[PDB]
Design a protein around this ligand. Structure first.
Ligand SMILES: Nc1nc2c(ncn2[C@@H]2O[C@H](COP(=O)(O)OP(=O)(O)O)[C@@H](O)[C@H]2O)c(=O)[nH]1
Ligand code: ALF
Ligand SMILES: [Cl-]
Ligand SMILES: [Cl-]
Ligand SMILES: [Co+2]
Ligand SMILES: [Co+2]
Lengths: 318, 132
């Protein structure tokens, strides 16, 4: 029992809990055929929430539904107790299906950068048939995609061959950052997640404040902490897949006018993103290890967390 | 006294309400949430469950303020993890607060425990020992 503690820090929804999920899959408790059943209800809740979100965006943005009966459908969806949902109704299936395929909702969906909408919305609504089946088992990939806010501070210990890594999931939101104090003692390494896809969104916690400008801000502060001078700092530029979608119509240059590189390139964009973060470092002797990740892909993570194992060992063993 | 039988405590697995029904079960779950620094969700929910039942438009307006400051106002001592939307939705409603002022946020916070802290309570050693 040689134990090393690791902090998963990052703003809201950078993909911290998803990482923990992937730990459990690669080196841990496993998600049994049964285990999976437990999530169903939340996948349902996610679906309803996302649609409830898009219906407000229709009001908010004054986007009209193409088919007028979709309003009374949206009315029905409006008024669902999302917690009391346990089964998936045929009327509610009809209502959502109908809405999702309304071109007004689709227009509203296109403009999700202008509002709060889970990144997993499309993944679920397109496989709504598969979900709505009365004998529905969620895949493991379904589970990773689920959006469940983390509140407070939770220790998730995993025994790798040589060592027991003690991982700590925290709340990404402003409200939770005052709590992070409670897990700062005795830290071998920070693992700071950043949603790459966040360069054009605004913050859930406040109106009209750029999400990436937040992360830079936070990263700098964390780095700056003196009780972290002997901790290894590993940066994860996450949601790289969502970046490959996003950069082909939302132009980084309009949010970060520094960017002298070309448009419509995932790579050249993200290399710039990385530079931005590395530059926030004051300490010249402190070297900042990084990675580009998609947290919802297990085969990808394994070549990172096998790699990051090797890094953290070499640092804080020999 | 106050102790629950193992059978009694096993029932708390059925659903989140079987736990909350239990006076002790509640005490244990709070203790748990303290251990992970998010007891503010359960206090707030409890705070709402009383407010909901408040009668006189005096208390219905001065409790309205008590809750807001404790949980909603930014940098509030017990600030709960919720959206600027919902928080503002409340802010405005508080001048002439009715029973259904926080009930939006109450529901989210419940779901936020239901789907998160509650499962973990169940996988805790304190609980599993209690089911013996
Ligand atoms: N497409 C995609 N979705 C992701 C990725 N990482 C996380 N997500 C999703 O984005 C949401 C954020 O995950 P979560 O771990 O809850 O973020 P946290 O709040 O910081 O823990 C979840 O719905 C995840 O399924 C990614 O690399 N690609
Ligand atoms: F925003 Al999080 F866990 F930090 F869902
Ligand atoms: Cl209908
Ligand atoms: Cl219908
Ligand atoms: Co109809
Ligand atoms: Co130095």
């Amino acid at each position: 029992r040689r134990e090393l503690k690791l902090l998963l820090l990052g703003t809201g929804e950078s993909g911290k809990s998803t990482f923990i999920k992937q730990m459990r899959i690669i080196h841990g408790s496993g998600y049994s055929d049964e285990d999976k059943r437990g999530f169903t209800k939340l996948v349902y809740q996610n679906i309803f929430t996302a649609m409830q979100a898009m219906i407000r965006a229709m009001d908010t943005l004054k986007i009209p539904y193409k088919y007028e009966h979709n309003k009374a459908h949206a009315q029905l969806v409006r008024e669902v107790d999302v917690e009391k949902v346990s089964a998936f109704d045929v009327p509610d299936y009809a209502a959502i299906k109908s809405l999702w395929n309304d071109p007004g909702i689709q227009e509203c969906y296109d403009r999700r950068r202008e509002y709060q909408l889970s990144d997993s919305t499309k993944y679920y609504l397109n496989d709504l048939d598969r979900v709505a089946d009365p004998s529905y088992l969620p895949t493991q990939q379904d589970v990773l995609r689920v959006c469940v806010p983390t509140t407070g501070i939770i220790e998730y210990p995993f025994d790798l061959q040589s060592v027991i890594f003690r991982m700590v999931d925290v709340g990404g939101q402003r409200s939770e950052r005052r709590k992070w104090i409670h897990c700062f003692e005795n830290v071998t390494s920070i693992m700071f997640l950043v949603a790459l896809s966040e360069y054009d969104q605004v913050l859930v916690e406040s109106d009209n404040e750029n999400r990436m400008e937040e992360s830079k801000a936070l990263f700098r502060t964390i780095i700056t902490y003196p009780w972290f001078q002997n901790s290894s700092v590993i940066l994860f530029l996450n949601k790289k897949d969502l970046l490959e979608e996003k950069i082909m119509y939302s132009h980084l240059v309009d949010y970060f006018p520094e960017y002298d590189g070309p448009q419509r390139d995932a790579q050249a964009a993200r290399e710039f993103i990385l530079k931005m973060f590395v530059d926030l470092n004051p300490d010249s002797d402190k070297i900042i290890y990084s990675h580009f990740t998609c947290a919802t892909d297990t085969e990808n993570i394994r070549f990172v967390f096998a790699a990051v194992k090797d890094t953290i060992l070499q640092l804080n063993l020999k | 006294f106050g102790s629950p039988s193992p059978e009694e405590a096993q029932l708390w697995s059925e659903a989140f309400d079987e736990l909350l029904a239990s006076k002790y079960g509640l005490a244990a779950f709070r203790a748990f949430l303290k251990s992970e620094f998010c007891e503010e969700n359960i206090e707030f929910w409890l705070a709402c469950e009383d407010f909901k039942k408040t009668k006189s438009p005096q208390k219905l307006s001065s409790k309205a303020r008590k809750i807001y400051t404790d949980f909603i106002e930014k940098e509030a001592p017990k600030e709960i993890n919720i959206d600027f939307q919902t928080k503002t939705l409340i802010a405005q409603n508080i001048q002439e607060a009715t029973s259904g002022c926080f009930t939006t946020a109450q529901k989210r916070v419940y779901s936020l425990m239901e789907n998160n802290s509650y499962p973990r309570f169940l996988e805790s050693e304190f609980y599993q020992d209690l089911c013996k």
